Amino acid sequence: TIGLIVPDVNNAVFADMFSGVQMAASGHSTDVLLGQIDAPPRGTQQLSRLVSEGRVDGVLLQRREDFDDDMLAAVLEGVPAVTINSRVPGRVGSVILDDQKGGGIATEHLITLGHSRIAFISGTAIHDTAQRRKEGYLETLASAGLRSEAAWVVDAGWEADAGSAALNTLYRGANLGKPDGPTAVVVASVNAAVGALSTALRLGLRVPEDLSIVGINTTWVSDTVYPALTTVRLPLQRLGEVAADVLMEHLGGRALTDTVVTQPTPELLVRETTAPPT
Template identity: 40%
Template sequence: MATLTEIARRAGVSVSVASRVLNGDPNLRTRPETRERVVQAAKDLNYTANYAGRALRLARSKALALIVPDVSTPLFADLLAGAADASGEQDHTLLLGRSDRVTAGGDLVRRLVGEGRVDGFVLQRSDDLSDQALENLVANDARIVLVASRTPRRRGSVVLDDVAGGRLATEHLLALGHRRVALIGGVERSDIARRREQGYTEALHDAGLRKRDAWVTRLGYSPDVAAAAARSLMATSPAPTAIVVANVNGAIGALTALRQGGFDIPGDVSVIAIHDQWMAAHTWPPLTTVKMPFYEVGYLAVRLLLDQLAGAPAEDIVVRDPAPLLILRESTGAPNSAV
């Protein structure tokens, strides 16, 4: 009986391509004439597929992987809880990993899927992983759902209503009477950061205010970077009386830097963060936040991934229910008339 190696040699293709053509892989990208050569070679050599082996290869591990930028941050606790609940409901095991492994080890996704260790991935990529870099790292036949961001390839995603989150945070400050409202945002290439800045801009516009470039930073969300951004903003003239920080981890860094700089919060400057985590209630002063539905994102991302594994097409979802929720604490207040 002819082997795949003989089919591939006769058709002038690799064994992998011959196997995927004969197995009808819908994700294989190759020219029609190449497919015809493989099919004709199989006919000429009376090739019979090994369906028992194919069934073994297609067996599921019933394990999924959730990959996040930093497994140590409390920010991802709700995301993990939602993903774990959805996995458990379908009798799947959920593994947790860091996205820097995806960046540094380009074959990680291919290897884990190819070796049958996991059936698919839910991935929140780090800001330094571009669309093209992601596509270069992910195998064409890997089932993957992105959380919080999207790519032009539309692999499937579940994102937050970041525009509404940015708008709600800014509207809270405007309602307190602030008119000099700054934004500490994410890096420019981040689609999350762009959406949150859009919400900030729309809220200012609706209040009859214009966005001032000097009061917007786009440097990232790490505590150290946000701390430097806060110091830079307060050195402008006039300085803002309120700051929206587009990520709670960055807000903790900004809050520390402002207090070290001798600013009273909220007397001199109010601070509000997008996202909530337990640490936000234990800063000084406790941080006012906009809680985003990260549990629902994790839950829906796993359900979407399982649907894809069952043959459903990739889908993009924006979680609008529940809506972003304002959590009032002590870091925001009316502007000081003397400032």
Template identity: 35%
Template sequence: MNNGRVTIRDVAAQAGVSVATVSKVLNDRYGVAAATVDRVREVIAELGYESSLVARSLRNQRTNVIGILVWDIEPFSAELLKGAARAIRGTDYELVVYAGGGKGSGRLGWERRYLSRLSGTLIDGAVLVTPTVLDVDSGSPVVAVDPHSGREAVPTVDADNLQGGRLATEHLIGLGHRRIGFLGRPPRDLESGPLREAGYRSALADAGIPVDPLLVQAAGYDESDVRNAVRDLLDLPERPTAIFAANDVTAIATMEVAVELGLRVPGDLSVIGFDNVPESMMTEPALTTIEQPIQLMGRLAVEMLLDMLAGRGPAQRHVRLPTRLIARASCAPHLPKRAENARLPAQPRS
């Protein structure tokens, strides 16, 4: 036996049978004695043999593998993978996760490149997580989670981002805040970003609070860009008393920068995020956020894809899930500062 990957020839040699016999056992074909089948399977288990996905694809025209394609592994996609893994339990399918680590020749169109590498040989279908485009022609079934461009012909799963943006802003307004900053994503980013900002603007309008353009910042993707955007808001002559960040990662960075600048959260600055990733519960103070059911989104996307692979159309082609407020400790009522002379003790009259 070689020192590398176990091959079908290794199994045949160890079991004392031909390669053709091992192949018949692997593919449940007739013509092999029961005792030989048992012996070959024992050797397969003993050696840890697995046929390659490519070989399986060439042999059966499918691999029974679903691809989860992401631009990068970060808190949102990591949570989504938990739900995706739960969806394949009890099925004949396996999952493979393919990520570029946030690198490559450009963010726009990454899903086309990834699909061209995997479809037809390694995976039977794919879930695209926050894809930039949906006009993909992979030849395999595809489901998109939280796509940039919104609903198209491809089945999609997303959350009610507009309502979530309203819930976050209404919560801050209800605490007495009027100067509320918004930290979003760059223009032409995920559809969810503009929808969350639209919810922010709508809630302010309903409360009769004009939107100050200086309070709306695009945070970018890199940590340095996010922190610079936070500093821009907090360095304003009339800084915000609260900030709604369009995702939890940005909200956590906002709290860190605020503390570095000598501000208390929530005493001097209330902060609310969006997503409810596990990290949001571990901050000090714990982050108030808008929950979108990320694990459920992953599970439903895979279930839709399994229906398509079975020749059934999904019961719903476009699923939108509700969002809800998770109130923790990073937001507090706004207490306007009294005028200096109002804090001075009354002077006795002469």
């Protein structure tokens, strides 16, 4: 049996990631025990108890956006563990997505539509996955001969409320959607993107006319809402299958590895929130 420890089961990547974990694990007649952890302080305790005590042979951990590298390294000391959608410095055993290429594809799509001033709403400063996606965006702008500004890049979060809050901050401080501000924003995760789209609409901005929006990752929500969010689909199911496999293989005696799921490549899903600027 294996443990899947997650920040919350409402998280955007959870459903596809879980189905992958479950399919691989069941394939080997191994069950998946699900656990959910709060914010630190209680967050770290639950994890120490829930990891130490262990009715599980090993652990798949999706790191919380408020857990620093320190809080994870200490807990994972001496535990067979694979981090998923995150990699902690100074240990081995992780499976991540091709985050830089995801940020790059999102950004590139906006540059091909004619946008020059493009903002980025990231996850937290703590989350290595957010920083990779930010890098992809930064490289892409640079190679295209374009500039970003400190004011156009906000560390927010994965969820709707942080996305909303960050859009508000761009709107009020950066003239996002106004006269000389950025005309498009890339959002590091799709739920934050749904929050951003909503806030742009409540503020009175036309989407896509006044502001284009691309989210990274895709859910039924991003595909359902009106206008439907243009997104970059990442292979979440594969990510869960590979991480489950790396863990189970390590329990059979193999080395833990640190890998990047690179196939399939990220898929641009052009919906209704991206157009050329005005």
